[PDB]
RNA sequence: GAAACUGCGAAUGGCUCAUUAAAUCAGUUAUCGUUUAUUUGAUAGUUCCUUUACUACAUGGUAUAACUGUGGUAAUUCUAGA
RNA sequence: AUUCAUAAUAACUUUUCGAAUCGCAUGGCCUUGUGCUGGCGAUGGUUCAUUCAAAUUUCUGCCCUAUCAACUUUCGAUGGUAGGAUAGUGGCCUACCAUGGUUUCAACGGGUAACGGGGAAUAAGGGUUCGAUUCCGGAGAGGGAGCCUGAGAAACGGCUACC
């Protein structure tokens, strides 16, 4: 029926639905990521290769990968597959899920779109995402451009400014792994320790063999 | 079963803490300790009940955040941190220094020691060993091992500590006339200084122990501990002087304390 | 009326909390059952720290009528006292603030009304907005 | 300063005596037959030797939560693709 | 007392580990250079010895019952041999071999309104009868199984399946 249809390039989606019989049912008998034609789906598209991306049914079940039997089955769902929001630390579960090849079971089906092609940016492509969480670690800040990494960033920080403190904060992701002391202080405090203690055990060792040999001077000469 | 026991009630720690019966509650459980059993005591039992500095359990935990507690120069802001034997609980400002000794009435002590002489503990050894890659070491009351000791002293003596680390100084053996000192048991810690040892090769060890009462008794080896050369002792003994003065003239002495 | 006679015993000054700990003996003939805090305001003058660094609880009225056992705690600091005074004694004295959160049966059910939320919950709140009424 | 990641607790505490007659248990050793996050104290001058342009040692990487968008089922501390 | 801690020799690992983590402070240095030194911690990490504990294990003690007179093995009963697992010991399990274990001091079997002890009640002494319950230890979380996470569980205010 309805179709949540997403899009990987800059970022937009919405949900579509067609009522006609096999116009909405050209989809089935192939499972995930194969192909969707353009004329059978709503008339905006024309022969555009689509990574069809799993379905949802009535009773709210998802469809994950460990299927190829076209019914609702039951299995053991540990860590990576659809479950776990939330449970605790063993934690397996026993869970049923609707799986494979789609048809007269679908309620909404998830789509993603490789080829817009010619027509229909206006519901699927036409705007980008105002992408929220920019790069924080110092190298991938520069990997936003490839800034020829000796830049000394605090140059092109990802600034977001909104004036609710009436100062707009002029601030950045609070960047991570800057090439500066006192991080450089910490690595030189490493060799400040590892020379001190390793020598001090040796000058404790050079004391002990001296004290033992003077003891051995009477021990081996016990007459 | 199934895991450790992070509680214990009262009536389960022995008499030597002198807690109340009708508190109707759980005892102070000691934390995991460096030194010994629950026949030791945590510091909060020493403060709020013997020395009487506080009432609330919120109160005694709030002293330790001000950083006045100290053993050995170590910080130890743990509330129910256990306290070993002769391990001097020195202080910051208020300047007192308390050595952990045994008085003549079962439980431990409330005894001050001076500012100097409080910068050394006294250490029973339990295990001398050569180990990994030729590194000799001793162990202590807390098991605080010390690299490169005085070689070939033995197990079972006492050790003077320099408190920068171990840095041991003087060996004190056991001979026919020295100082020994009981630690634990029904007749714990007065003095008997020695009279004559035995061994009992193989099973257990006993020692004949002669008081200033001038009779004898015998306590087994794990309570036996040497102080030093006779008549020296390294610690000023508390004001019971280690007799087990007898009950027939315990009563005659205490109304001669009040004068009537 | 007949010399209430604040007398003090076991006067132990604690150096590591800047305070004194002591037991007050009170023999008050011909007039009983005075107060929490009048005796403090007579005790806080003879110890010369201030008027309100003292923390009392007591006046255990002994049998007969005319004798009681008090227990006050003067500190050697004014503002640092409130950092270590028991807060129920401060709201008895009125210098601090009394807290007022909810009672027991509203708070622990609120913990039960805390785990059902997914994250910060407004993802559900957008979705329970759109659907209902769909 | 939320959530959420990570670490940690959840294995204590409380409650009952149905099973349980050398079984548990009281004392009493033994562990030369073992493990132990936590508590303590000591603690790692060699790190790859593809040879010296593998290259960041003045600091490389993914693969992601919470969040944002539209979802499904009447449902549960249920859950999707982007 | 050891084939103990240990050292040494030749290999050894889908090479285990041996700081690419945060805090307050700002100094000295003389060659003011992203030069060289350096405080007090906090976490976390291998190894040894502790500690907190777990797990086995010797030594004695048990209520009534002979209208309970011989129980035990070819599905280990007892022991040896060699292994498989095990945190490690062990017929714990497996193949081969030997026929052995307890007993008229009561084993075995049945009963038990039997949790086991520290105690409680009555009281000349000598004792009889309770003790589910305040403390210690055990078992269990409707009935028997099985398992993950975690140092610690065969957990049950954890899970899986059957009744």
From Swiss-Prot, chain A:
**Alphabetical UniProt keywords:** Cytoplasm, Isopeptide bond, Nucleus, Phosphoprotein, Ribonucleoprotein, Ribosomal protein, Ribosome biogenesis, rRNA processing, Ubl conjugation
Q: Does the keyword Nucleus apply?
A: yes
PROSITE patterns attached to this UniProt entry: RIBOSOMAL_S6E
What GO terms fall under cellular component here? 90S preribosome; cytosol; cytosolic small ribosomal subunit; nucleolus; nucleoplasm; small-subunit processome
An example of a GO molecular function for this protein is: structural constituent of ribosome
Q: Which domain of life is it from?
A: Eukaryota
Q: Which residues carry this modification: Phosphothreonine?
A: 163
Any Pfam family: Ribosomal_S6e
Q: Which Gene3D superfamilies match?
A: 1.20.5.2650
The location annotated for the cross-link Glycyl lysine isopeptide (Lys-Gly) (interchain with G-Cter in ubiquitin) is 116, 131, 149, 214
Q: What else is known?
A: Present with 66000 molecules/cell in log phase SD medium. There are 2 genes for eS6 in yeast.
Protein name in the entry = Small ribosomal subunit protein eS6A
Native species of this protein?
Answer: Saccharomyces cerevisiae (strain ATCC 204508 / S288c) (Baker's yeast)
The root-end lineage is:
Eukaryota, Fungi, Dikarya, Ascomycota, Saccharomycotina
Q: Which gene is annotated as encoding this protein in its UniProt record?
A: RPS6A
UniProtKB/Swiss-Prot annotation, chain B:
Keyword RNA-binding listed: yes
**Highest rank taxon of the organism:** Eukaryota
PROSITE patterns from the xrefs? RIBOSOMAL_S4E (PS00528), S4 (PS50889)
UniProt entry tagged with the keyword RNA-binding: yes
Q: Which residues carry this modification: Phosphoserine?
A: 31, 246
GO CC field = 90S preribosome; cytoplasm; cytosol; cytosolic small ribosomal subunit
Tell me which InterPro entries the record gives: KOW, Rib_uL2_dom2, Ribosomal_eS4, Ribosomal_eS4_C, Ribosomal_eS4_central_region, Ribosomal_eS4_central_sf, Ribosomal_eS4_KOW, Ribosomal_eS4_N
One GO MF term on file is: RNA binding
A Gene Ontology biological process noted in the UniProt record is: cytoplasmic translation
Q: Which residues carry this modification: Phosphothreonine?
A: 114
The covalently linked position for Glycyl lysine isopeptide (Lys-Gly) (interchain with G-Cter in ubiquitin), per the record, is 61, 133, 160, 167, 173, 178, 210, 232
Domain spans labelled S4 RNA-binding: 41-104
Q: Name one Pfam family in it.
A: S4
Where in the chain are disulfide-linked cysteines found? none
Localisation? Cytoplasm
Q: What family classification does the UniProt entry report for this protein?
A: Belongs to the eukaryotic ribosomal protein eS4 family.
Q: Indicate the quaternary assembly.
A: Component of the small ribosomal subunit (SSU). Mature yeast ribosomes consist of a small (40S) and a large (60S) subunit. The 40S small subunit contains 1 molecule of ribosomal RNA (18S rRNA) and 33 different proteins (encoded by 57 genes). The large 60S subunit contains 3 rRNA molecules (25S, 5.8S and 5S rRNA) and 46 different proteins (encoded by 81 genes).
Additional detail: Present with 573 molecules/cell in log phase SD medium. There are 2 genes for eS4 in yeast.
Q: What is this protein called?
A: Small ribosomal subunit protein eS4A
Name of encoding gene: RPS4A
UniProtKB/Swiss-Prot annotation, chain C:
Q: Where is the composition biased (Basic residues)?
A: 104-114, 123-134
Q: Where is this cross-link: Glycyl lysine isopeptide (Lys-Gly) (interchain with G-Cter in ubiquitin)?
A: 20
- Keywords carried by this UniProt record: Acetylation, Cytoplasm, Isopeptide bond, Phosphoprotein, Ribonucleoprotein, Ribosomal protein, Ubl conjugation
Kindly report the protein's main subcellular placement as a broad class: cytoplasm
Spell out the post-translational modification annotation for this entry.
N-terminally acetylated by acetyltransferase NatA. Also partially acetylated by NatC.
Named from the GO MF annotations, one term is:
structural constituent of ribosome
Q: Which Pfam family would be a valid example here? A: Ribosomal_S24e
Which parts of the chain are coiled coil? none
**Which domain of life does the UniProt lineage start with?**
Eukaryota
Q: What's this protein's function?
A: Component of the ribosome, a large ribonucleoprotein complex responsible for the synthesis of proteins in the cell. The small ribosomal subunit (SSU) binds messenger RNAs (mRNAs) and translates the encoded message by selecting cognate aminoacyl-transfer RNA (tRNA) molecules. The large subunit (LSU) contains the ribosomal catalytic site termed the peptidyl transferase center (PTC), which catalyzes the formation of peptide bonds, thereby polymerizing the amino acids delivered by tRNAs into a polypeptide chain.
Q: How does it assemble?
A: Component of the small ribosomal subunit (SSU). Mature yeast ribosomes consist of a small (40S) and a large (60S) subunit. The 40S small subunit contains 1 molecule of ribosomal RNA (18S rRNA) and 33 different proteins (encoded by 57 genes). The large 60S subunit contains 3 rRNA molecules (25S, 5.8S and 5S rRNA) and 46 different proteins (encoded by 81 genes).
The name of this protein is: Small ribosomal subunit protein eS24A
């Amino acid at each position: 029926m309805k179709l949540n249809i997403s899009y990987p390039v800059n970022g937009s989606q919405k949900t579509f639905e067609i009522d006609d019989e096999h116009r909405i049912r050209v989809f089935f008998d192939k499972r995930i990521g194969q192909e969707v034609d353009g004329e059978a789906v709503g008339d905006e598209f024309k022969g555009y290769v689509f990574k069809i991306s799993g379905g949802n049914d009535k009773q709210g079940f998802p469809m994950k990968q460990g299927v190829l039997l076209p019914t609702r089955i039951k299995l053991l769902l540990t860590k990576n597959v659809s479950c776990y929001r939330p449970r605790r630390d063993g934690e397996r579960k026993r869970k049923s899920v609707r799986g494979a090849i789609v048809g007269p079971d679908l309620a909404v089906l998830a789509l993603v779109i490789v080829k817009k092609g010619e027509q229909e940016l206006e519901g699927l492509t036409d705007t980008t995402v105002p992408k929220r969480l920019g790069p924080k670690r110092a190298n991938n800040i520069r990997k936003f451009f490839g800034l020829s990494k000796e830049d000394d960033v605090r140059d092109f920080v990802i600034r977001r400014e909104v004036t609710k403190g009436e100062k707009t904060y002029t601030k950045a992701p609070k960047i991570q792994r800057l090439v500066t002391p006192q991080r450089l202080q910490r690595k030189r405090h490493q060799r400040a320790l590892k020379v001190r203690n390793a020598q001090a055990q040796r000058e404790a060792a050079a004391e002990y063999a001296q004290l033992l040999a003077k003891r051995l001077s009477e021990r081996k000469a016990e007459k | 079963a199934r895991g450790p026991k992070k509680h214990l009630k009262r009536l389960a720690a022995p008499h030597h803490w002198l807690l109340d019966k009708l508190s109707g509650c759980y005892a102070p459980r000691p934390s995991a300790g460096p030194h010994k059993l629950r026949e030791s005591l945590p510091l909060i039992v020493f403060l709020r009940n013997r020395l009487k500095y506080a009432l609330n359990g919120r109160e005694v935990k709030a002293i330790l955040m001000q950083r006045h507690v100290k053993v050995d120069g170590k910080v130890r802001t743990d509330t129910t941190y256990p306290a070993g034997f002769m391990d001097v609980i020195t202080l910051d400002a208020t300047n007192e220094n308390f050595r952990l000794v045994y008085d003549v009435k079962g439980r431990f002590a409330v005894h001050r020691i001076t500012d100097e002489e409080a910068s050394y503990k006294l250490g029973k050894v339990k295990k001398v060993q050569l180990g990994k890659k030729g590194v000799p070491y001793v162990v202590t009351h807390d098991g605080r091992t010390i690299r490169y000791p005085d070689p070939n002293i033995k197990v079972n003596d006492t050790v003077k500590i320099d408190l920068a680390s171990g840095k041991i100084t003087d060996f004190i053996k056991f001979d026919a006339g020295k100082l020994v000192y009981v630690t634990g048991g029904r007749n714990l810690g007065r003095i008997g200084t020695i009279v004559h040892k035995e061994r009992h090769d193989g099973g257990f060890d006993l020692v004949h122990i002669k008081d200033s009462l001038d009779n004898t008794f015998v306590t087994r080896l794990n309570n036996v501990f040497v102080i030093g050369e006779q008549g020296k002792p390294y610690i000023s003994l508390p004001k019971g002087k280690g007799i087990k003065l007898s009950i027939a003239e315990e009563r005659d002495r205490r109304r001669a304390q009040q004068g009537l | 009326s007949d010399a209430v006679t604040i007398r003090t015993r076991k006067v132990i000054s604690n150096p590591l909390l800047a305070r004194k700990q002591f037991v007050v003996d009170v023999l008050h003939p011909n007039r009983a059952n005075v107060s929490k805090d009048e005796l403090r305001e007579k005790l806080a003058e003879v110890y010369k720290a201030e008027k309100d660094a003292v923390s009392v609880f007591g006046f255990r009225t002994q049998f007969g009528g005319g004798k009681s056992v008090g227990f006050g705690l003067v500190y050697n600091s004014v503002a640092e006292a409130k950092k270590f005074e028991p807060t129920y004694r401060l709201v008895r004295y009125g210098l601090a603030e009394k807290v007022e959160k909810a009672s027991r049966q509203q708070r622990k059910q609120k913990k039960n009304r805390d785990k059902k939320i997914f994250g910060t919950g407004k993802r559900l709140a957008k979705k329970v907005a759109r659907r209902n009424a769909d």
